């Protein structure tokens, strides 16, 4: 059977000798909106990364605006309705939200 | 000035291809004596006077 395994922690944070490792990363797309403000983050930051992928592993794309740079891919869902787990763009460029 | 910069980098002194219509509202602030401002891989925007 296929065995999934996490890898590379040259970015992950800890508590012992060596708080954090690096601030920014590369072509972000799957990360909690915490590090996007450099403000006091939490330990739940991982839950988001995992969740987002789980969604994609069912739909085949991001839980919000796919192929849309996280720059604006944020402000558009900044509020992101409660319990919402999806938000694509209608054929007319419109934006639709949904918790289904 | 703008050209001199490009003659060293190979592109605009700020945002490349980014039409001037929205190009200004993005560099209107421009740090004290800034001469560069591209867009990160994540579409983000970064400024620099180097």
Which tokens hold the place of B17?
């291809």
**B19 has a chain A CB within 8 A of its CB:** no
Residues B49 and B35: beta-carbon distance below 8 Å: yes
Q: How many Å apart are CA A57 and CA A9, to the nearest integer?
A: 22
Report the C-alpha dihedral over residues A30, A36, A40, A43, rounded to 10 degrees. Answer: 0
Question: If you search the block for the tokens 């992101």, which residue do you land on?
Answer: A80
Chains A and B form CB pairs within 8 A to the count of 22
Picking from A71, A74, A76 by the largest number of B CB atoms within 10 A of its own CB, the best residue to mutate is: A71
Q: How many Å apart are CA A61 and CA A42, to the nearest integer?
A: 26
Residues B49 and B36: beta-carbon distance below 8 Å: yes
Resolution at which this structure was determined, Å: 4.5
- Left if phi > 0, otherwise alpha if psi is -120 to 50, otherwise beta: which for A84? beta
Experimental technique behind these coordinates: X-ray
Q: How many Å apart are CA A53 and CA A42, to the nearest integer?
A: 19
Question: If you search the block for the tokens 């763009």, which residue do you land on?
Answer: A89
Closest residue of chain B to A73, computed from CA coordinates: B43
Q: How many Å apart are CA B24 and CA B20, to the nearest integer?
A: 6
């Amino acid at each position: 059977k296929i065995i999934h395994k996490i890898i590379d922690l040259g970015y992950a944070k800890d508590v012992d000798q060596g708080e954090l490792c690096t601030e920014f990363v590369g072509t972000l797309q799957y990360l909690a909106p915490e590090l996007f403000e450099n403000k006091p983050y939490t330990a739940t930051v991982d839950y988001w990364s995992f969740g987002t992928m789980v969604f994609e592993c069912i739909a085949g794309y991001r839980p919000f605006l796919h192929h849309l740079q996280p720059f604006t891919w944020h402000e558009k869902i900044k509020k992101k309705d409660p319990k919402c787990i999806f938000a694509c763009e209608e054929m007319s460029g419109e934006v639709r939200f949904s918790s289904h």
